[PDB]
Amino acid sequence: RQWALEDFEIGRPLGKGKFGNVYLAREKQSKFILALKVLFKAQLEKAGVEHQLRREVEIQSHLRHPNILRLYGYFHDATRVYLILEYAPLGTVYRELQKLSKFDEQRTATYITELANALSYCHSKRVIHRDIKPENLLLGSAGELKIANFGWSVHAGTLDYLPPEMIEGRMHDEKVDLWSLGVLCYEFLVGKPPFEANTYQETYKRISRVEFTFPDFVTEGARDLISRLLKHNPSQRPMLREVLEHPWITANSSKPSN
Amino acid sequence: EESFRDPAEVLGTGAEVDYLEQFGTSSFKESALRKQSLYLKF
Ligand SMILES: Nc1ncnc2c1ncn2[C@@H]1O[C@H](COP(=O)(O)OP(=O)(O)O)[C@@H](O)[C@H]1O
């Protein structure tokens, strides 16, 4: 028994890019709703990423966590690769941040809690996942976070989320994910990342020297967490379990209610 | 509320755009629906 295109019916497109298309879809027997990501072999080969693709899908197919988009399986035909994915219906955190400009402390602490949980699980499996930019975070039907840039995409900045050890070209480890979490926490509360600048050269400077400032509305609890996360030395950044124990996180997060 | 189709009806429809263009299709189908085919006598 293998996965087959025959197993599925295909709904509206969710995104399109040079590498392919993502569709809303449905497994025929169960009527289970999911997303089908469809990748052009020609473009993959032309990009020389066939080895890289196999590695990424292999990694994602073994991650099983409520805040990570599941990859249920994959298959191919003569000209396309097909990834069977969990569907997240409420869009990206990126869009939500556009709409609201800034998040309050309860939404922020709750999102950071879900991400730290997902990342702790990833590290337990020796998986490092630094790119947790808002556009790579989907929202499930209950508004819960889903890290969505495992696998493969159909498609002075971006540097914005890089840790000092990475931009300086040194050895890096899973502690890059703690730096990301700090950048993201700041961006959630402030509406922009902390080291934003006009030029590549100047953004490098601010990161490498860890130079940033808090708006006056950012509370002491929030400043304390973000400062602990944005340490130049990776070993001085907290463990994820310590983030989940932080007083500001524990006080402001919430679990679902009426 | 969301509709689903056979994959053969969806995949590559962006690519086959020229083959999905046929003058008079909707007008002909409409008038086909409205016209009767009379029983074959003799
Ligand atoms: N499993 C999914 N559920 C819902 N939307 C998705 C899913 N996967 C991707 N998308 C959306 O489809 C588009 C393409 O996604 P992807 O191929 O991951 O590239 P991107 O880097 O733009 O997210 C994006 O808008 C993304 O949010």
Numbering used by the authors:
A (entry chain A): 126 to 280, 290 to 392
B (entry chain B): 522 to 563
Question: Would you copy out the relevant sentences from the publication that reported this structure?
Answer:
Crystals of TACC3N‐ACID bound to an Aurora‐A 122–403 C290A, C393A, D274N mutant (Aurora‐AM3KD) diffracted to 2.0 Å resolution. Residues 126–280 and 290–392 of Aurora‐AM3KD were included in the final model, with the part of the activation loop being disordered consistent with its unphosphorylated state (Cheetham et al, 2002; Burgess et al, 2016). TACC3N‐ACID mostly adopts an extended conformation but with two short regions of secondary structure: a 310‐helix formed by 528–530, and an α‐helix by 546–555 (αTR). Due to crystal packing, each molecule of TACC3N‐ACID contacts three molecules of Aurora‐AM3KD. These contacts cover the entire length of TACC3N‐ACID, which allowed it to be fully resolved, and involved three distinct sites on the surface of Aurora‐AM3KD (labelled as sites 1–3). The interaction at site 1 involves residues 523–535 of TACC3N‐ACID binding to the surface of the β‐sheet in the Aurora‐A N‐lobe contacting β‐strands β1–β3 and β5 and adopting an extended conformation, with the exception of a short 310‐helix at aa527–532. The total surface area buried in this interface is ~950 Å2, and the key contributions are made by TACC3 residues F525, L532, P528, and Aurora‐A residues I135 and R151. The F525 side chain is inserted into a pocket formed by the side chains of R151, I158, L149, E134, and main chains of G136 and A150, of Aurora‐A. The interface also involves an intermolecular salt bridge between E523 of TACC3 and R137 of Aurora‐A and a H‐bond between the main chain oxygen of TACC3 R526 and the main chain amine of Aurora‐A I135. In the complex with TACC3N‐ACID, Aurora‐AM3KD is in an inactive conformation in which the αC‐helix is distorted and K162 and E181 are separated and unable to form a salt bridge. Based upon NMR and biochemical data, we conclude that the interaction of TACC3 in solution is that observed at site 1 in the crystal structure and that this site contributes to the activation of Aurora‐A by TACC3.
